[PDB]
């Protein structure tokens, strides 16, 4: 094994990194790394493109709830479960998508915006926090409100060092679980002493009182690390290179010509450059042929090729950045060079696998926890009715009553006609269903059927031709 040795000819002798856990290798330089990632996001053209792609493809424009409680385990019945699902779904749609934006305390976003901001925070910071609180003065029906807590606001009390039970503002029991998080308040206007407050992870009633979502790697990782840690240095150096090249081009193309002489610099520029004597401005119209005495001379400089291979080196670095961050090269760089159909489809698939993985984990888990946190109040407040003769009540099995799936926007095809023929061919055979086909297009098939049966009756009533789906 040459890997663990000195190397080829001792080239690697000075490459012997210490073997430390993820906590020991991340926690000392957490805030500086997160701040650098924030600087890259807020001040670089490609980072904002990557974050916008993350938000737009993982979640999209609309984010929908699909409720499928487990009836067989609970032994309640088909129709009771279906009625419960329909009623609770309608209640959620008329609580989540409210215009007043009363779901969150700040009154600035809707639910889909909260999910998008959570995904973004998971992108350029490594985790996301949600706090669910109650306000008594709320006179509306459901009250649970939500807030997004920035990771920077969570830190150790009194800025003390890290300990065995509390690392980077997160308390840890004997095992790897979490109990409560210290959340500071930060006051931009003029500062204050600063305060650290305790918020337990879960109330003694089992309700989710504080949400912490991330994807771990090792056995023990108290707080996750963002995705930019691979390619921060390359992106900053690339930005420096681009600015330097631009400034160099501006300063090289500036000096068009050069006058050599022995006279006064006013008469020399008068007699050769043609500037009006009354430094010396020149009017820029016409073609001029100067006359030069033996000592004088006129020289027209030549600049280098302004982009002498810099585009190719940018391609190399941008492909590296695309490999690091996760989005494909064409989506990141907007280049979209010449390519066949197979190349485009393959690249789209390699992007889509990652996007579906991220949506299925991060945003889906966040939305599921938020939805469970609301149901309990609505159940407790007697807004919805639990089916009778149930094996369990809500508390004994939370995940049984609230097993739900989320459907967002689907892929936009390169050639949808081929995809439509794919869907129709699968539908004619047995390999697929209407539910899965309507899900790929981001539609709920029961809504489609209800609109369908309303529409066939509307067409029949007015005297139009009966539609295709109508029963003979």
């Amino acid at each position: 094994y040459h890997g663990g040795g000195s190397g080829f000819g001792g080239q690697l002798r000075s490459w012997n990194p210490p073997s430390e856990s993820v906590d020991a290798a991340l926690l000392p330089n957490f805030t500086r790394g997160n701040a650098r990632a924030d600087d890259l996001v807020r001040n670089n053209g490609y980072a904002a493109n990557a974050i916008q792609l993350h938000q737009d493809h993982i979640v999209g424009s609309f984010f929908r709830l699909s409720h499928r409680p487990s009836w067989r385990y609970l032994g309640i019945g088909e129709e009771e479960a279906r009625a419960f699902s329909r009623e609770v779904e309608a209640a959620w749609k008329e609580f989540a998508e409210d215009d007043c934006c009363c779901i969150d305390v700040e009154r600035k976003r809707t639910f889909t915006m909260m999910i998008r901001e959570g995904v973004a925070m998971h992108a350029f910071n490594g985790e996301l926090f949600v706090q669910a609180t109650w306000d008594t003065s709320s006179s509306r029906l459901f009250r649970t409100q939500f807030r997004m807590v920035s990771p920077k606001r969570i830190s150790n009390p009194n800025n003390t060092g890290d300990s065995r039970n509390c690392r980077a503002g997160v308390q840890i029991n004997d095992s790897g679980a979490a109990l409560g998080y210290y959340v500071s308040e930060d006051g931009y206007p003029g500062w204050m002493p600063q305060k650290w407050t305790w918020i337990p992870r879960e109330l003694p009633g089992g309700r989710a009182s504080f949400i912490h979502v991330f994807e771990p790697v090792e056995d023990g990782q108290t707080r996750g690390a963002n995705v930019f840690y691979s390619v921060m240095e390359q992106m900053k150096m690339l930005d420096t290179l681009q600015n330097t090249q631009l400034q160099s081009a501006i300063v090289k193309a500036m000096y068009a010509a050069t006058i050599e002489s022995e006279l006064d610099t006013q008469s020399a520029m008068d007699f050769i450059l043609g500037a009006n004597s009354q430094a010396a401005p020149v009017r820029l119209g016409g073609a001029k042929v100067p006359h030069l005495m033996p000592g004088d001379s006129l020289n027209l400089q030549t600049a280098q090729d302004t982009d002498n291979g810099y585009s190719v080196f940018e391609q190399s670095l941008l492909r590296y950045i695309a490999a690091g961050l996760g989005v494909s090269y064409e989506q990141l760089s907007r280049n979209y060079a010449q390519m066949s159909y197979s190349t485009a489809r393959a690249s789209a698939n390699e992007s889509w696998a990652y996007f579906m993985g991220r949506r299925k984990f991060v945003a889906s888990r966040q939305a599921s926890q938020m939805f469970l946190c609301w149901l309990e109040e609505a159940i407790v407040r007697r807004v919805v009715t639990l089916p009778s003769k149930a094996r369990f009540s809500f508390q004994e099995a939370r995940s049984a009553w609230g097993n739900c799936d989320w459907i967002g926007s689907g892929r936009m095809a390169i050639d949808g006609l081929k995809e439509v023929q794919e869907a129709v061919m699968l539908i004619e055979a047995g390999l697929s269903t209407y539910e899965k086909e309507c899900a790929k297009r981001g539609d709920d098939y029961q809504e489609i059927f209800a609109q369908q049966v309303r529409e066939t009756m509307e067409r029949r009533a007015a005297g139009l031709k009966p539609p295709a789906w109508a029963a003979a």
Partner: protein, 48 residues
């Protein structure tokens, strides 16, 4: 500069010196200067 502060009001800080013993300090500093746009809208009599 380490935490990006300039021209604020009553900035406090709390630090502990890394010495062989240990002591804890607390200090607030600010730059108060009071001005009037027009120095003359008041008349101040000393009475008797």
């Amino acid at each position: 500069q380490r935490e990006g502060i300039n021209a604020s009001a009553r900035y406090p800080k709390n630090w502990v010196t890394t010495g062989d013993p240990a002591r804890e300090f607390t200090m607030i500093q600010s730059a108060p200067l009071m001005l009037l746009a027009d120095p003359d809208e008041f008349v101040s009599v000393q009475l008797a």
